[PDB]
């Protein structure tokens, strides 16, 4: 019981982990011509995309930070 | 301009909402795979009960997040397009 409930746990993270990896994979394939883009364009494109990164993998790990304390919580009961 | 970032918007909404009506029929059909309530005693119907709580609870926590992820990539992406513009 204790063990599907951590699987089903790892499971939803898995899949709300892909769901933003996929839309940030083919976002950055849509993105204007490299003959568009002004020098600070290419900075600009640059800094935002490896924000989005950033703010991809701090809520895949509060996600799995949410998981791990609930887990602890149903093994208590 | 105006139109692409409400076609913009408007993607991510959609999406989502995809997203997490199959998040609420995954848990549904899970939490719906389960011994008959004529087996389980009340101290286990009291403990299936919290499991799906526990499950819902989590799923519903970061369904907000993730809305607040798009709404915080809808603002950053129109910053953009408006840097792209001017």
Same mark, same amino acid.
């Given at each position: 019981t204790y063990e599907e409930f951590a699987a #089903?746990? !790892?499971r939803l993270d898995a899949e709300f982990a892909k769901k933003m990896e996929?839309? +940030?994979k083919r976002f950055f394939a849509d993105k204007? !011509?490299?003959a568009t883009l002004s020098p600070e364009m290419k900075e600009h494109? $640059?800094? @935002?995309e490896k924000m989005i990164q950033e703010h991809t !993998? #701090? @809520? +895949?790990k509060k996600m799995r $930070?949410?998981?791990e304390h609930f887990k /602890? #919580? @149903? /093994? $208590?009961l």
């Open positions: #089903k746990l !790892d996929e839309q +940030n204007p !011509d490299e494109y $640059e800094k @935002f !993998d #701090k @809520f +895949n $930070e949410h998981s /602890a #919580k @149903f /093994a $208590e």
